[PDB]
Design a protein around this ligand. Structure first.
Ligand code: MG
Length: 292
């Protein structure tokens, strides 16, 4: 519809305002194949901090319609947008759908490189050990004691990152320690990841997602990400945003007067790669208000 061409226009406007590498050919191939799903589903536009003065630009959508579960993968495979190169990552979505009942799934795209990531959410939570028979990076099982010790063992979602040959596991925050700043401080210390500010630690006690990143090349836990929702531009803690990300909060395109935002804090090895901020605009205004 008009809604589909409006969405592609907004993405190019973002990528050009905030200096993001993009490719109009790849956007065209994606929108031809997924454009309707972007209009008709929970849809978000992401900006991230990975370079000092150049934001990256991403876009994602989230499918809750039970009769549609699985199509994003089939569509992507048929259209050539996702071509399985025999990689270890390539068999995981088939193994996941056989093994667990799926409640939701999603697709993340990069405005220069295309389909980047597909995620699957489980109906219910499972002991993370139930996933050890999947072809996951060996670093999952070799950290099973760490996972138990830090109460990151109520598993409910998989992110399959095809650009990085990595897997993100999402863990439900079931334990009373998950509502205390000290737990997040100690988790990041135990991982020897970059320490967070005190404002962020206090925010983290709120109800958010937590994901851990495992990769097939590395025996270590590579990354950690906390996602937190915010009702509107006012609710965003702007002390934790560099000027370029603060500008995005104020000018990010949406179809609502006061769109909510989902904020993401990535952490990695201290004095190394992996520590940055992600900012997702709730483009339809219905994604964020559906807290847990
Ligand atoms: Mg839908």
């Amino acid at each position: 519809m008009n809604d589909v061409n409006r969405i592609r226009t907004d993405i190019i406007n973002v990528a050009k305002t905030f200096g993001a590498e993009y490719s109009e050919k790849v956007l065209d191939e994606v929108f031809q194949v997924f454009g309707e799903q972007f209009a008709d589903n929970s849809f978000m536009i992401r900006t991230s901090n990975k370079q000092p003065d150049k934001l990256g630009c991403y876009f994602r959508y989230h499918e809750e319609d039970e009769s549609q579960l699985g199509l994003a993968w089939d569509i992507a495979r048929k259209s050539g947008l996702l071509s399985d190169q025999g990689r270890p990552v390539d068999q995981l979505i088939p193994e996941i759908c056989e093994t667990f009942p799926i409640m939701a799934d999603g697709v993340d795209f990069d405005v220069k490189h295309g389909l980047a990531k597909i995620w699957q959410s489980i109906k219910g939570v499972v002991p993370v050990q139930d996933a050890f028979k999947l072809s996951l990076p060996a670093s999952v099982t070799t950290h099973s004691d760490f996972l138990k010790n830090h109460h990151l063992d109520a598993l409910y979602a998989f992110g399959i990152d095809y650009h990085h040959s990595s897997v993100n596991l999402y863990f439900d925050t079931y334990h009373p320690k998950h509502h205390t700043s000290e737990y997040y401080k100690n988790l990041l210390q135990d991982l020897q990841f970059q320490p967070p500010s005190d404002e962020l630690l206090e925010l983290l006690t709120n109800n958010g997602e937590i994901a851990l990143t495992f990769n097939f090349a590395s025996p270590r836990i590579e990354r950690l990400c906390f996602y937190l929702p915010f009702l509107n531009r006012e609710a965003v803690p702007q002390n934790l945003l560099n000027p370029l990300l603060k500008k995005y909060i104020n000018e990010a395109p949406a179809l609502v007067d006061n769109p909510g935002f989902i904020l993401g804090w990535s952490f990695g090895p201290q004095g190394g790669k992996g520590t940055y901020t992600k900012v997702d605009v709730d483009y339809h205004g219905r994604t964020v208000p559906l807290f847990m």
